[PDB]
Amino acid sequence: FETVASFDFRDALSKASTPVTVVATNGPFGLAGLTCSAVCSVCDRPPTVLLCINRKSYAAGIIKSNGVLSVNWLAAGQAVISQTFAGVGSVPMEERFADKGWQTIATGAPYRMDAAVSFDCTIANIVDVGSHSVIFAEVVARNHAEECTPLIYHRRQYATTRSL
Amino acid sequence: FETVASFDFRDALSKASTPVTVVATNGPFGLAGLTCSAVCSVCDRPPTVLLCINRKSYAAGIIKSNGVLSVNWLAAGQAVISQTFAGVGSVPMEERFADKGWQTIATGAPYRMDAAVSFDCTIANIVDVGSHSVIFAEVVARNHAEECTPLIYHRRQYATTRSL
């Protein structure tokens, strides 16, 4: 078979929805983060998630060398955090972590303590596919804001949930 | 670092949200599909998605031996399809596909033509991690439905999107 056009693929993907996360890191190689909507759980033993990020980015470089990271599922009121970590407004990488919402838990990675879900993680394995590194990360601590709804991305806009 | 208890990881995941998909297949090993809350896009060249499914599923071995599959992101009105493919009502596998909204496109996998998004795919790589197979699949065709609001799963309930 021939694969669809990359343009067609991206067009279609805009019709699917995703949660919005920020992946962050800190350690000997420094502080960095980016928004990532290609994230999912893998298995519960050992508890493992994966995230797919383009290897060309500033943050990918620092995440992979620090070897630890957080995955932070953002809550409905946090679209501005997603924008900043997606490069909207071009906030310099190290100025992105100003507020008190970011704290360490176990690994030294910054964890967003008011995110719907924050997992603090160690990198266990990496599979490269096309432009992206698929990073498998084992969860060594968790945190949750008080109940709240998710930030969702769909058709190139932010949204949150409602019952059917 | 020690990993979190598996019970803690599962509890945390219920507070994240995911799109609801059905992964389906057909071929020499027969028809099968199942609901899947762990899917994401990987890279656009070649256009690749991944999905993680428990190796103990009846469907998982058939999907991997057939070598082809579809990923169908369900729309807000399709909770009954999700229910059926999560095994509610114990509907026999072949009968799940009797409805004419299920069609082939390119590979022979059943594609849900009215799903918000349906990708028809060939398996390219399988990585087994803990209890699950992480299946990398390249997209060879898609189906384009009209303006489809998502079916989302969050805190053990179905949901759809609203604006912020």
mmCIF file of C-alpha atoms in Angstrom:
data_model
loop_
_atom_site.group_PDB
_atom_site.id
_atom_site.type_symbol
_atom_site.label_atom_id
_atom_site.label_comp_id
_atom_site.label_asym_id
_atom_site.label_seq_id
_atom_site.Cartn_x
_atom_site.Cartn_y
_atom_site.Cartn_z
ATOM 1 C CA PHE A 1 0.000 0.000 0.000
ATOM 2 C CA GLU A 2 0.909 3.656 -0.448
ATOM 3 C CA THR A 3 0.695 5.807 2.707
ATOM 4 C CA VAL A 4 -1.616 8.854 2.668
ATOM 5 C CA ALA A 5 -0.100 12.323 2.045
ATOM 6 C CA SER A 6 1.403 13.935 5.135
ATOM 7 C CA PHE A 7 -0.860 16.884 4.518
ATOM 8 C CA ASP A 8 -3.931 14.630 4.463
ATOM 9 C CA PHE A 9 -2.724 12.876 7.632
ATOM 10 C CA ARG A 10 -2.367 16.163 9.535
ATOM 11 C CA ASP A 11 -5.695 17.373 8.206
ATOM 12 C CA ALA A 12 -7.412 14.232 9.514
ATOM 13 C CA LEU A 13 -5.652 14.415 12.860
ATOM 14 C CA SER A 14 -7.165 17.872 13.416
ATOM 15 C CA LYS A 15 -10.575 16.129 13.473
ATOM 16 C CA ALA A 16 -9.525 13.766 16.263
ATOM 17 C CA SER A 17 -9.239 15.174 19.769
ATOM 18 C CA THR A 18 -6.397 14.890 22.310
ATOM 19 C CA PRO A 19 -5.667 15.877 25.913
ATOM 20 C CA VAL A 20 -3.132 18.670 26.231
ATOM 21 C CA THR A 21 0.029 17.990 28.288
ATOM 22 C CA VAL A 22 3.217 19.844 29.036
ATOM 23 C CA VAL A 23 6.329 17.702 29.293
ATOM 24 C CA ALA A 24 9.043 19.301 31.458
ATOM 25 C CA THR A 25 12.481 18.437 32.777
ATOM 26 C CA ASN A 26 15.336 19.730 34.905
ATOM 27 C CA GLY A 27 18.692 18.262 36.004
ATOM 28 C CA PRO A 28 22.371 18.714 34.992
ATOM 29 C CA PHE A 29 21.456 19.706 31.438
ATOM 30 C CA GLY A 30 19.086 22.418 32.604
ATOM 31 C CA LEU A 31 15.450 23.402 32.541
ATOM 32 C CA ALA A 32 13.060 22.949 29.565
ATOM 33 C CA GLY A 33 9.545 21.911 28.568
ATOM 34 C CA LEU A 34 7.148 21.746 25.660
ATOM 35 C CA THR A 35 3.526 21.085 24.970
ATOM 36 C CA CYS A 36 2.772 17.548 23.773
ATOM 37 C CA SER A 37 -0.542 16.067 22.715
ATOM 38 C CA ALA A 38 0.921 12.732 21.566
ATOM 39 C CA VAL A 39 0.906 10.966 24.951
ATOM 40 C CA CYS A 40 -0.661 7.781 26.296
ATOM 41 C CA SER A 41 -0.448 5.173 29.024
ATOM 42 C CA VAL A 42 1.278 1.955 28.106
ATOM 43 C CA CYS A 43 0.935 -0.535 31.033
ATOM 44 C CA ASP A 44 0.603 -0.469 34.789
ATOM 45 C CA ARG A 45 3.466 -2.768 35.658
ATOM 46 C CA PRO A 46 5.930 -1.243 35.638
ATOM 47 C CA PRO A 47 3.701 1.872 35.390
ATOM 48 C CA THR A 48 4.726 3.373 32.027
ATOM 49 C CA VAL A 49 3.528 6.142 29.792
ATOM 50 C CA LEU A 50 4.888 7.249 26.435
ATOM 51 C CA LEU A 51 5.154 10.622 24.736
ATOM 52 C CA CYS A 52 6.210 11.410 21.157
ATOM 53 C CA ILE A 53 8.299 14.522 20.529
ATOM 54 C CA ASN A 54 10.224 15.783 17.536
ATOM 55 C CA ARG A 55 13.945 15.188 18.141
ATOM 56 C CA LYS A 56 14.866 18.547 16.616
ATOM 57 C CA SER A 57 13.607 20.686 19.478
ATOM 58 C CA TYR A 58 15.464 22.430 22.273
ATOM 59 C CA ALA A 59 13.441 20.625 24.922
ATOM 60 C CA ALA A 60 13.853 17.156 23.375
ATOM 61 C CA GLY A 61 17.623 17.519 23.652
ATOM 62 C CA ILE A 62 17.522 18.501 27.327
ATOM 63 C CA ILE A 63 14.814 15.926 28.316
ATOM 64 C CA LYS A 64 16.760 13.051 26.807
ATOM 65 C CA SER A 65 19.996 13.958 28.487
ATOM 66 C CA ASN A 66 18.508 14.729 31.900
ATOM 67 C CA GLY A 67 16.878 11.249 31.657
ATOM 68 C CA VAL A 68 13.916 12.416 33.826
ATOM 69 C CA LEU A 69 10.771 14.377 32.999
ATOM 70 C CA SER A 70 7.243 15.157 34.081
ATOM 71 C CA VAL A 71 4.082 14.687 32.061
ATOM 72 C CA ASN A 72 1.399 17.179 33.107
ATOM 73 C CA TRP A 73 -2.163 16.799 31.826
ATOM 74 C CA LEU A 74 -3.458 20.345 31.842
ATOM 75 C CA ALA A 75 -6.832 21.360 33.314
ATOM 76 C CA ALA A 76 -9.488 23.454 31.553
ATOM 77 C CA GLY A 77 -8.276 26.744 32.989
ATOM 78 C CA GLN A 78 -4.659 26.307 31.783
ATOM 79 C CA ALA A 79 -4.723 27.124 28.066
ATOM 80 C CA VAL A 80 -2.211 29.893 28.689
ATOM 81 C CA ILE A 81 0.337 27.314 30.002
ATOM 82 C CA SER A 82 -0.185 25.239 26.850
ATOM 83 C CA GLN A 83 0.279 28.297 24.650
ATOM 84 C CA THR A 84 3.549 29.283 26.350
ATOM 85 C CA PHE A 85 5.018 25.775 26.090
ATOM 86 C CA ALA A 86 3.939 25.593 22.427
ATOM 87 C CA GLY A 87 6.040 28.652 21.727
ATOM 88 C CA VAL A 88 3.133 31.112 21.449
ATOM 89 C CA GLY A 89 4.572 34.529 22.277
ATOM 90 C CA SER A 90 8.119 33.115 22.020
ATOM 91 C CA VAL A 91 8.784 32.983 25.747
ATOM 92 C CA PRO A 92 12.501 32.093 26.258
ATOM 93 C CA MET A 93 12.733 28.495 27.483
ATOM 94 C CA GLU A 94 14.058 29.240 30.952
ATOM 95 C CA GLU A 95 11.518 32.037 31.621
ATOM 96 C CA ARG A 96 8.680 29.587 31.185
ATOM 97 C CA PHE A 97 8.735 28.294 34.790
ATOM 98 C CA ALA A 98 8.254 31.551 36.786
ATOM 99 C CA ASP A 99 5.245 30.676 38.924
ATOM 100 C CA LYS A 100 4.835 28.673 42.125
ATOM 101 C CA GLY A 101 2.632 26.101 40.369
ATOM 102 C CA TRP A 102 5.840 24.318 39.257
ATOM 103 C CA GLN A 103 7.564 22.282 42.041
ATOM 104 C CA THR A 104 9.868 19.277 42.251
ATOM 105 C CA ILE A 105 8.584 15.940 43.649
ATOM 106 C CA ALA A 106 10.961 13.081 43.180
ATOM 107 C CA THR A 107 13.283 13.383 40.155
ATOM 108 C CA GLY A 108 14.037 17.093 40.103
ATOM 109 C CA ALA A 109 11.854 17.567 36.988
ATOM 110 C CA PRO A 110 9.404 20.497 37.493
ATOM 111 C CA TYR A 111 5.857 19.098 38.114
ATOM 112 C CA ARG A 112 2.794 21.256 37.543
ATOM 113 C CA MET A 113 1.058 20.858 40.923
ATOM 114 C CA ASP A 114 -2.266 22.292 39.820
ATOM 115 C CA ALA A 115 -2.395 20.155 36.607
ATOM 116 C CA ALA A 116 -5.201 17.580 36.438
ATOM 117 C CA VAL A 117 -2.537 14.876 36.583
ATOM 118 C CA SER A 118 1.240 15.172 36.991
ATOM 119 C CA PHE A 119 3.515 12.171 36.687
ATOM 120 C CA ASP A 120 7.170 12.497 37.653
ATOM 121 C CA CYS A 121 9.155 9.978 35.539
ATOM 122 C CA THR A 122 12.430 8.371 34.581
ATOM 123 C CA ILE A 123 13.123 7.584 30.893
ATOM 124 C CA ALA A 124 13.149 3.811 30.400
ATOM 125 C CA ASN A 125 13.438 3.390 26.625
ATOM 126 C CA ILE A 126 13.303 5.361 23.403
ATOM 127 C CA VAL A 127 12.031 4.230 19.999
ATOM 128 C CA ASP A 128 12.743 6.523 17.048
ATOM 129 C CA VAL A 129 10.176 6.767 14.283
ATOM 130 C CA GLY A 130 10.467 9.300 11.462
ATOM 131 C CA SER A 131 11.141 12.745 12.926
ATOM 132 C CA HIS A 132 10.031 11.717 16.425
ATOM 133 C CA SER A 133 11.460 10.035 19.484
ATOM 134 C CA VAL A 134 8.867 7.877 21.278
ATOM 135 C CA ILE A 135 9.988 8.068 24.864
ATOM 136 C CA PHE A 136 8.816 5.455 27.361
ATOM 137 C CA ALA A 137 8.878 6.875 30.867
ATOM 138 C CA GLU A 138 8.272 5.008 34.174
ATOM 139 C CA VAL A 139 6.228 6.856 36.759
ATOM 140 C CA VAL A 140 7.961 7.393 40.078
ATOM 141 C CA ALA A 141 5.537 9.954 41.635
ATOM 142 C CA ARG A 142 2.091 11.444 40.921
ATOM 143 C CA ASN A 143 0.055 14.533 41.840
ATOM 144 C CA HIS A 144 -3.473 15.851 41.147
ATOM 145 C CA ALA A 145 -5.165 19.217 41.422
ATOM 146 C CA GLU A 146 -8.457 19.182 43.226
ATOM 147 C CA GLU A 147 -11.009 17.820 40.768
ATOM 148 C CA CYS A 148 -11.349 19.810 37.561
ATOM 149 C CA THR A 149 -12.055 19.206 33.924
ATOM 150 C CA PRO A 150 -9.470 18.537 31.147
ATOM 151 C CA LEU A 151 -7.937 20.865 28.602
ATOM 152 C CA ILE A 152 -8.705 19.217 25.289
ATOM 153 C CA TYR A 153 -7.471 20.135 21.799
ATOM 154 C CA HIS A 154 -9.800 19.580 18.807
ATOM 155 C CA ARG A 155 -10.053 21.179 15.337
ATOM 156 C CA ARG A 156 -7.198 23.537 16.212
ATOM 157 C CA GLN A 157 -8.894 25.044 19.263
ATOM 158 C CA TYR A 158 -8.945 24.393 23.001
ATOM 159 C CA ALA A 159 -12.046 22.947 24.625
ATOM 160 C CA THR A 160 -13.070 21.102 27.756
ATOM 161 C CA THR A 161 -15.580 18.366 28.478
ATOM 162 C CA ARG A 162 -19.337 18.147 29.119
ATOM 163 C CA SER A 163 -21.622 15.152 29.709
ATOM 164 C CA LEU A 164 -23.266 13.624 26.629
ATOM 165 C CA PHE B 1 13.715 5.852 42.161
ATOM 166 C CA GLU B 2 11.029 3.237 42.871
ATOM 167 C CA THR B 3 7.992 3.238 40.546
ATOM 168 C CA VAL B 4 4.498 4.162 41.965
ATOM 169 C CA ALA B 5 2.179 1.363 42.965
ATOM 170 C CA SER B 6 0.213 0.073 39.982
ATOM 171 C CA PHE B 7 -3.007 0.939 41.881
ATOM 172 C CA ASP B 8 -1.891 4.620 42.137
ATOM 173 C CA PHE B 9 -1.022 4.807 38.440
ATOM 174 C CA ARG B 10 -4.444 3.441 37.422
ATOM 175 C CA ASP B 11 -6.207 5.882 39.797
ATOM 176 C CA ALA B 12 -4.243 8.829 38.318
ATOM 177 C CA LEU B 13 -5.098 7.780 34.759
ATOM 178 C CA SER B 14 -8.870 7.944 35.535
ATOM 179 C CA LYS B 15 -8.312 11.679 36.124
ATOM 180 C CA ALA B 16 -6.724 12.204 32.711
ATOM 181 C CA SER B 17 -8.961 12.206 29.655
ATOM 182 C CA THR B 18 -8.690 10.283 26.357
ATOM 183 C CA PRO B 19 -10.514 10.167 23.016
ATOM 184 C CA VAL B 20 -12.547 6.949 22.661
ATOM 185 C CA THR B 21 -11.433 4.754 19.727
ATOM 186 C CA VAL B 22 -12.237 1.340 18.364
ATOM 187 C CA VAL B 23 -9.353 -0.582 16.796
ATOM 188 C CA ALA B 24 -10.583 -3.160 14.315
ATOM 189 C CA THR B 25 -9.091 -5.748 11.967
ATOM 190 C CA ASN B 26 -9.881 -8.447 9.428
ATOM 191 C CA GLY B 27 -7.879 -10.900 7.397
ATOM 192 C CA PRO B 28 -6.988 -14.579 7.427
ATOM 193 C CA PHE B 29 -7.166 -14.731 11.243
ATOM 194 C CA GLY B 30 -10.688 -13.312 11.260
ATOM 195 C CA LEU B 31 -12.626 -10.251 12.369
ATOM 196 C CA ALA B 32 -12.025 -8.549 15.717
ATOM 197 C CA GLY B 33 -11.977 -5.156 17.322
ATOM 198 C CA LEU B 34 -11.817 -3.590 20.748
ATOM 199 C CA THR B 35 -12.124 -0.251 22.422
ATOM 200 C CA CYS B 36 -8.747 1.506 22.962
ATOM 201 C CA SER B 37 -7.937 4.508 25.140
ATOM 202 C CA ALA B 38 -4.216 4.557 24.347
ATOM 203 C CA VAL B 39 -3.623 5.869 20.851
ATOM 204 C CA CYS B 40 -1.586 8.698 19.484
ATOM 205 C CA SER B 41 -0.033 10.086 16.330
ATOM 206 C CA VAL B 42 3.674 9.472 16.032
ATOM 207 C CA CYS B 43 5.096 11.234 12.938
ATOM 208 C CA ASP B 44 3.814 12.333 9.567
ATOM 209 C CA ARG B 45 6.401 10.788 7.276
ATOM 210 C CA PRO B 46 5.650 8.015 6.944
ATOM 211 C CA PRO B 47 2.350 8.899 8.622
ATOM 212 C CA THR B 48 2.299 6.688 11.668
ATOM 213 C CA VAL B 49 0.093 6.208 14.671
ATOM 214 C CA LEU B 50 0.525 3.858 17.656
ATOM 215 C CA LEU B 51 -1.929 2.075 19.871
ATOM 216 C CA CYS B 52 -1.339 0.054 23.008
ATOM 217 C CA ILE B 53 -3.443 -2.997 23.644
ATOM 218 C CA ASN B 54 -3.370 -5.674 26.281
ATOM 219 C CA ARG B 55 -1.781 -8.883 24.905
ATOM 220 C CA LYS B 56 -4.399 -10.992 26.710
ATOM 221 C CA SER B 57 -7.235 -9.583 24.530
ATOM 222 C CA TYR B 58 -8.846 -11.994 22.138
ATOM 223 C CA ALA B 59 -8.647 -9.225 19.592
ATOM 224 C CA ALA B 60 -4.936 -8.495 20.137
ATOM 225 C CA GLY B 61 -3.586 -11.723 18.645
ATOM 226 C CA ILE B 62 -5.929 -11.513 15.628
ATOM 227 C CA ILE B 63 -4.964 -7.866 14.988
ATOM 228 C CA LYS B 64 -1.219 -8.710 15.176
ATOM 229 C CA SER B 65 -1.461 -11.852 13.000
ATOM 230 C CA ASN B 66 -3.646 -10.102 10.357
ATOM 231 C CA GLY B 67 -1.064 -7.337 10.114
ATOM 232 C CA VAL B 68 -3.652 -4.640 9.266
ATOM 233 C CA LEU B 69 -6.030 -2.552 11.387
ATOM 234 C CA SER B 70 -8.137 0.571 11.544
ATOM 235 C CA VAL B 71 -8.219 3.204 14.274
ATOM 236 C CA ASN B 72 -11.631 4.793 14.553
ATOM 237 C CA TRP B 73 -12.047 7.896 16.672
ATOM 238 C CA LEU B 74 -15.703 7.789 17.694
ATOM 239 C CA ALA B 75 -18.102 10.749 17.592
ATOM 240 C CA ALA B 76 -20.210 12.036 20.491
ATOM 241 C CA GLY B 77 -23.262 10.025 19.376
ATOM 242 C CA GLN B 78 -21.473 6.693 19.255
ATOM 243 C CA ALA B 79 -21.234 5.591 22.879
ATOM 244 C CA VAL B 80 -23.114 2.406 21.972
ATOM 245 C CA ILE B 81 -20.308 1.339 19.599
ATOM 246 C CA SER B 82 -17.724 1.953 22.342
ATOM 247 C CA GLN B 83 -19.877 -0.072 24.768
ATOM 248 C CA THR B 84 -20.254 -2.972 22.332
ATOM 249 C CA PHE B 85 -16.477 -3.156 21.665
ATOM 250 C CA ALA B 86 -15.625 -2.957 25.344
ATOM 251 C CA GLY B 87 -17.609 -6.173 25.546
ATOM 252 C CA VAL B 88 -20.876 -4.881 26.999
ATOM 253 C CA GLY B 89 -23.656 -7.293 25.990
ATOM 254 C CA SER B 90 -21.137 -9.922 24.942
ATOM 255 C CA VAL B 91 -21.959 -9.353 21.235
ATOM 256 C CA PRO B 92 -20.248 -11.951 19.054
ATOM 257 C CA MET B 93 -17.244 -10.470 17.289
ATOM 258 C CA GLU B 94 -18.377 -10.960 13.666
ATOM 259 C CA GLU B 95 -21.815 -9.604 14.481
ATOM 260 C CA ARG B 96 -20.238 -6.355 15.786
ATOM 261 C CA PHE B 97 -19.287 -5.641 12.152
ATOM 262 C CA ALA B 98 -22.662 -6.614 10.528
ATOM 263 C CA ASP B 99 -23.899 -3.040 10.543
ATOM 264 C CA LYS B 100 -23.257 -1.375 7.205
ATOM 265 C CA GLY B 101 -21.497 1.667 8.684
ATOM 266 C CA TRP B 102 -18.528 -0.738 8.870
ATOM 267 C CA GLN B 103 -16.807 -1.038 5.468
ATOM 268 C CA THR B 104 -13.416 -1.830 4.012
ATOM 269 C CA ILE B 105 -11.360 0.913 2.400
ATOM 270 C CA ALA B 106 -7.867 -0.275 1.475
ATOM 271 C CA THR B 107 -6.411 -2.974 3.722
ATOM 272 C CA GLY B 108 -9.451 -5.144 4.393
ATOM 273 C CA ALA B 109 -9.731 -3.902 8.015
ATOM 274 C CA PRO B 110 -13.324 -2.814 8.903
ATOM 275 C CA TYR B 111 -13.416 1.045 8.850
ATOM 276 C CA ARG B 112 -16.236 2.861 10.695
ATOM 277 C CA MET B 113 -17.228 5.262 7.955
ATOM 278 C CA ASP B 114 -19.225 7.547 10.207
ATOM 279 C CA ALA B 115 -16.572 7.824 12.912
ATOM 280 C CA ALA B 116 -15.117 11.255 13.462
ATOM 281 C CA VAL B 117 -11.895 9.891 12.013
ATOM 282 C CA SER B 118 -11.029 6.506 10.647
ATOM 283 C CA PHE B 119 -7.498 5.538 9.588
ATOM 284 C CA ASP B 120 -6.896 2.380 7.635
ATOM 285 C CA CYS B 121 -3.403 1.043 8.441
ATOM 286 C CA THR B 122 -0.704 -1.575 8.010
ATOM 287 C CA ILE B 123 1.264 -2.657 11.038
ATOM 288 C CA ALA B 124 4.957 -1.629 10.757
ATOM 289 C CA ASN B 125 6.427 -2.380 14.200
ATOM 290 C CA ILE B 126 5.392 -4.056 17.445
ATOM 291 C CA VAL B 127 7.067 -3.369 20.770
ATOM 292 C CA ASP B 128 5.916 -5.397 23.768
ATOM 293 C CA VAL B 129 6.090 -3.463 27.028
ATOM 294 C CA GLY B 130 4.746 -4.899 30.285
ATOM 295 C CA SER B 131 1.288 -6.398 29.657
ATOM 296 C CA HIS B 132 0.700 -4.519 26.393
ATOM 297 C CA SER B 133 1.725 -4.559 22.769
ATOM 298 C CA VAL B 134 2.629 -1.149 21.428
ATOM 299 C CA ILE B 135 1.597 -1.368 17.817
ATOM 300 C CA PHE B 136 3.013 1.153 15.297
ATOM 301 C CA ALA B 137 0.870 1.380 12.171
ATOM 302 C CA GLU B 138 1.265 3.413 8.961
ATOM 303 C CA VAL B 139 -1.822 5.125 7.585
ATOM 304 C CA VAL B 140 -2.752 4.041 4.039
ATOM 305 C CA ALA B 141 -6.279 5.544 3.830
ATOM 306 C CA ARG B 142 -8.599 7.660 5.842
ATOM 307 C CA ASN B 143 -12.237 8.384 6.035
ATOM 308 C CA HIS B 144 -13.577 11.833 6.236
ATOM 309 C CA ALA B 145 -16.840 12.246 8.128
ATOM 310 C CA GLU B 146 -18.713 15.582 8.567
ATOM 311 C CA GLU B 147 -17.953 17.950 11.503
ATOM 312 C CA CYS B 148 -17.542 15.316 14.249
ATOM 313 C CA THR B 149 -17.604 16.281 17.895
ATOM 314 C CA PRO B 150 -15.564 13.771 19.881
ATOM 315 C CA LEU B 151 -16.469 11.005 22.236
ATOM 316 C CA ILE B 152 -14.165 11.447 25.224
ATOM 317 C CA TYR B 153 -13.605 9.308 28.289
ATOM 318 C CA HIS B 154 -12.890 10.967 31.616
ATOM 319 C CA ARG B 155 -13.359 9.867 35.238
ATOM 320 C CA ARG B 156 -15.026 6.668 34.132
ATOM 321 C CA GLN B 157 -17.748 8.454 32.108
ATOM 322 C CA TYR B 158 -18.302 9.353 28.484
ATOM 323 C CA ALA B 159 -18.187 13.022 27.561
ATOM 324 C CA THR B 160 -17.931 15.303 24.636
ATOM 325 C CA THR B 161 -16.390 18.722 24.179
ATOM 326 C CA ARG B 162 -17.605 22.246 24.911
ATOM 327 C CA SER B 163 -15.780 25.537 24.326
ATOM 328 C CA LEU B 164 -13.779 27.054 27.172
#
